[PDB]
Ligand binder design. Structure first.
Ligand code: MET
Ligand code: CO
Ligand code: CO
Ligand code: NA
Length: 282
């Protein structure tokens, strides 16, 4: 199983004119980065809708993960699930991104572009989907095995899922945001994995990346305290190898320099009055 290279991008997939686009579609940047971290009750309830739809899309596309399938196909499936439920795929036209979800195989850390790449026996495939509906986003991802995956890679996926759910369980009002990355990086280090530092979780609401940053490593200098109504993602990328990466000339696809494999999981979370709610629960 050799290092991946780009395949053929299929043309831009249509979205029915009736489905409202985020403001940033077509534009080189997005109007985001200064939105409130705590959401109104209206936006929280809308975020439950968007979260459930994104979770649905992710689960539909994950079911298609099998040897012989292309990344493009997974995109087709997610895109059609979103459009059928009246959601806009938030990645489509986000800063020029050409597709409806991100598909990241093996050594690809994140941000892979669905294309003619054919999945083979033993691969690990992250699908990251975001839904825009009711003026709000819902963002989720998971790494799926394709055929007979090596124990080393089954364990990386299972331990990344676990690091994610452990971090989710720390979320409660009055706790320091920094606890999340402490819990993840401790669990990853227990098995001699390395957490990706350059890519982080984010606040999400009426905007995709609202300015709130959630680190997945231990950084106790962050002073932010979790507050009821705060919405953000936890989305650690966990590497078997070193952290050093390259970005392909597509300007998106991020790959490990040593070509060792890496896994990621993501939910969108609400800080409740007493704990957490997973908005992107299936
Ligand atoms: C740099 S755009 C990445 C989109 C992805 N859905 C995320 O979780 O942010
Ligand atoms: Co995502
Ligand atoms: Co995200
Ligand atoms: Na990967």
């Amino acid at each position: 199983r050799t290092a991946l290279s780009p395949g053929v991008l299929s043309p831009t997939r249509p979205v029915p004119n009736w489905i409202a686009r985020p403001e940033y579609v077509g534009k080189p940047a997005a109007q985001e980065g200064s939105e409130p971290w705590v959401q109104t009750p209206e936006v929280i309830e809308k975020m439950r809708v968007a979260g459930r739809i994104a979770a649905g899309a992710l689960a539909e596309a994950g079911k298609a993960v099998a040897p012989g399938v292309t990344t493009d196909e997974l995109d087709r499936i997610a895109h059609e699930y979103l459009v059928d439920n009246g959601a806009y795929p938030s990645t489509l036209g986000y800063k020029g991104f050409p597709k409806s979800c991100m598909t990241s195989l093996n050594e690809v850390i994140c941000h892979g572009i669905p294309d003619s790449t054919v999945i083979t026996d033993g691969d690990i495939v992250n699908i990251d989907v975001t839904a825009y509906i009711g003026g709000v986003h819902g963002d989720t991802n998971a790494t799926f095995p394709a055929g007979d995956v090596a124990d080393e890679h089954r364990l990386l996926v299972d331990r990344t899922r676990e690091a994610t759910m452990r971090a989710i369980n720390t979320v409660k009002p009055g706790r320091a945001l920094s606890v999340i990355g402490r819990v993840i990086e401790s669990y990853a280090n227990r098995f001699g994995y390395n957490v990706v530092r350059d890519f982080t979780g984010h606040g999400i609401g009426t905007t995709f990346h609202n300015g709130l940053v959630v680190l997945h490593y231990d950084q106790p200098a962050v002073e932010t305290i979790m507050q009821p109504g705060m919405t953000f993602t936890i989305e650690p990328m966990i590497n078997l190898g070193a952290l050093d990466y390259e970005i392909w000339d597509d300007g998106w696809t991020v790959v490990t320099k040593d070509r060792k494999w890496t896994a990621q999981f993501e939910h969108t979370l609400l800080v409740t009055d007493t704990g957490v709610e997973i908005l992107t629960a299936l």
